[PDB]
């Protein structure tokens, strides 16, 4: 048993709800919430951006000092950084950025960071400003984490389409 409330149950281990993720982290203090990262770790908007806000700008700070010691990440790639004041850690996972001519086939790679922990609140890898088909996100989130994944979808008209077209 776990305190989040009001999700979708969609499959044996993915959940889904109509909410702000800033606004569920703040509300749940989750041990892990993922970040929708790019590699550079510049939390500029979308997910990242707003996340970022909500600790002050102390996410940027060290993602700076993470980026400086350790060069970029992969796209699929990850790490784990502290959750400040929204969740214990945060897990930066970059997906595929189509407006950036990423490869969509890294999307299974990005969700497979997920299975590393056993429970995360998170947002649909490469959704929103990264581009991707968002019923295609969920599709891969389902096929390839194994771990309990509740996903915060903002967007309401957006949540209803994903729930109605799952197959
Ligand atoms: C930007 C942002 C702020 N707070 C959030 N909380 C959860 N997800 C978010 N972004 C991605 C998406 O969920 C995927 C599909 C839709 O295009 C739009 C919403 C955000
Ligand atoms: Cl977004």
């Known amino acids: 048993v776990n305190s989040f409330s009001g999700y979708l ?3 044996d281990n993915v959940y889904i709800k109509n909410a702000d993720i800033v606004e569920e982290a703040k509300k749940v203090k989750p041990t892990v919430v993922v970040n929708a990262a790019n590699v550079y770790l510049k939390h500029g908007g979308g997910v990242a951006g707003a996340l970022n806000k909500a600790t002050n700008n102390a996410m940027q700070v060290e993602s700076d000092d993470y ?4 060069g ?3 796209v699929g790639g990850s790490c784990v ?6 969740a214990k850690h945060c897990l930066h996972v970059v997906g595929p950025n ?5 490869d969509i086939q890294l999307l ?9 922990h056993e429970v995360l609140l998170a947002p649909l890898l490469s959704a929103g400003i990264f581009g991707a088909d968002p019923i ?7 096929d390839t984490v194994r771990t309990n994944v509740y996903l915060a979808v903002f967007d309401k008209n957006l949540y209803d389409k994903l729930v109605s077209s799952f197959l």
């Open 9 to 11: 149950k969609l499959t």
């Open 67 to 70: 980026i400086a010691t350790n």
């Open 72 to 74: 970029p990440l992969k």
């Open 81 to 86: 950084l502290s959750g400040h004041n929204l």
């Open 98 to 102: 189509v407006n950036k001519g990423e």
């Open 108 to 116: 299974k790679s990005a969700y497979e960071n997920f299975n590393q």
């Open 136 to 142: 295609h996100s969920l599709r891969v989130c389902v």
